[PDB]
From a paper:
Human estrogen receptor alpha (hERα) belongs to the family of nuclear receptors (NRs). Here, we show that the application of PROSS server algorithms to the ligand-binding domain of human estrogen receptor alpha (hERα) enabled the development of variant ERPRS* that comprises 24 amino acid substitutions and exhibits multiple improved characteristics. Crystal structures reveal several salient features, i.e. the introduction of a tyrosine corner in a helix-loop-helix segment and the formation of a novel surface salt bridge network possibly explaining the enhanced thermal stability.
These variants are identical to ERPRS*, but contain one or two additional AA exchanges that have been shown to improve the crystallization behavior of hERα when crystallized with small molecule agonists (in case of ERPRS*(+)) or antagonists (ERPRS*(−)). The structure of ERPRS*(−) was solved in complex with the antagonist raloxifene at a resolution of 1.6 Å. At the same time, the antagonist-bound structure differs significantly from the agonist-bound structure due to the distinct repositioning of H12, which is essential for hERα function. The crystal structures clearly demonstrate that the ligand-triggered switching between the active and inactive conformation of hERα is fully preserved in ERPRS*. This also extends to the structural binding characteristics of the antagonist raloxifene and to the resulting inhibition of coactivator binding. Moreover, no detectable coactivator-binding affinity is observed upon binding of the antagonist raloxifene.
Author numbering:
A (entry chain B): 310 to 460, 463 to 548
B (entry chain A): 311 to 461, 467 to 547
């Protein structure tokens, strides 16, 4: 696929924006807020699997590798979507069209304000850089494919590792091509590519801190089970 | 210029320290962790000297310098370890007198996971034939980027961004001087910056492993780093 075909496929695969089912009449307790966020994330996961299967090349990886990438990336992907939705809302996190939250609301849950501040800082960075939808979808696909923890290896794992490397190179090419099509100088192209890929290190950090936080709130039932992900991947929706 | 950035970073490389490993002592976990702790402690002093040689870093306020060092110090130690280890497949070269394999990492509770990640990162660097010029650029990028999204202030942030961009320019310049095509330049740049996200992951998991370990002086406290910045 040429660079435009990759971007076109990713744009067409964008998931829908879901609502939190927020009810203004309910007391807005910590448990109520976290319950809304939990059910929202759970409903977003199904759409994330559908999106992943449309990432060029993803379904040509082994089903094991598909699951493993989703297991590693799912919170990063939720977070970058949040940051994108919040770009045009300084100081706010737009979890859903009916759930806009600020720092002060995060303070009510121990450990949440620190992560809110990191998410807000990323949204500010995206706003300042005027991140384009074409760049966002490339970054989200890179997150999915780069998520696997470094690792005992078999011919199958090496085969999929090389495929993932080739896919990442093509998305890099597409990100650069979009910038060139948009008129950026060669010097601006490498600087902006570097700045955008460096933000992915911050999103990784936020995901790690977020996982720590979820485990301190819920003992178990925090990560999607392997069987759950495989079930959703195999569905012929 | 780009050549001046690369030459400056090469000249700023810290010395390779020894662990003081004594083969005659019983290699208890306490003895090993002690060697690694004191080694890291001694490396930190040289990391401060090096940081002040990263172009632009001296022009930042003490508060900003401390914040960046606070966020980056373990990643910087780890990328150094990975670099020293890429001539030793299957081993981590903490120091020339302390070369450890995966088995020796099992002695520490919860360390084999981090060990394997570091080993795999060293293999990645070996496969890519990472050059010293690229390595020093990556270390400088880690220093200027790890803490920039956790911070007048708006101008200070943009100032650090410009400092980063000058290192990116130098890293691409080196690749262009080495003969890579434009496509290979952008591909290799992306490959290296994506490895940095994994080194960030390793640092985060190492931090969780150090705090949970109850280790003494897990992090260089703010006041500690603040005082070391005034040594020179
Ligand atoms: O609040 C959440 C969140 C809540 C519950 C989650 O997991 C619920 C458990 N569920 C188990 C089955 C598999 C899917 C996860 C995940 C994110 C979100 C985030 C978060 C923010 C700060 C913080 O300290 C921790 C998390 S970021 C985010 C983006 C979304 O699109 C949805 C929820 C969220
Ligand atoms: O063993 C260590 C290590 C041990 C103690 C440390 O903290 C020491 C105390 N702290 C140091 C900074 C000043 C404040 C005191 C840091 C690294 C090293 C690493 C490590 C690996 C896996 C893991 O799970 C945790 C750490 S990586 C590394 C590279 C080095 O050059 C030296 C030590 C190391
Ligand atoms: Cl020494
Ligand atoms: Cl010394
Ligand atoms: Cl090269």
């Amino acid at each position: 696929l040429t660079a435009d075909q990759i971007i076109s496929a990713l744009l067409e695969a964008e998931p829908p924006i879901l609502y939190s089912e927020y009810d203004p009449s309910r007391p807005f307790s910590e448990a109520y807020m976290m319950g809304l966020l939990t059910n929202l994330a759970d409903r977003e996961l199904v759409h994330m699997i559908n999106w992943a299967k449309k990432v060029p090349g993803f379904v040509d990886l082994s089903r094991h590798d598909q699951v493993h990438l989703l297991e590693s990336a799912w919170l990063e992907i939720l977070m970058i979507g949040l940051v994108w939705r919040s770009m045009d809302h300084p100081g706010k996190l737009l979890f859903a069209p009916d759930l806009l939250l600020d720092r002060e609301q995060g303070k009510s849950v121990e450990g949440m304000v620190e992560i809110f501040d990191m998410l807000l800082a990323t949204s500010e960075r995206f706003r300042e850089m005027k991140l384009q939808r074409e760049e966002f979808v490339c970054l989200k696909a890179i997150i999915l494919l780069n998520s696997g923890v470094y690792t005992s290896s078999t011919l199958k794992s090496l085969e999929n590792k090389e495929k993932i490397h080739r896919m990442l190179d093509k998305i890099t090419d597409a990100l650069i091509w979009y910038m060139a099509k948009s008129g950026l100088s060669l010097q601006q192209q490498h600087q902006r590519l570097a700045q955008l890929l460096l933000i992915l290190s911050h999103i990784r950090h936020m995901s790690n801190k977020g996982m720590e936080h979820l485990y301190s709130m819920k003992s178990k039932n925090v990560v999607p089970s392997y069987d759950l992900l495989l079930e959703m991947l195999d569905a012929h929706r």
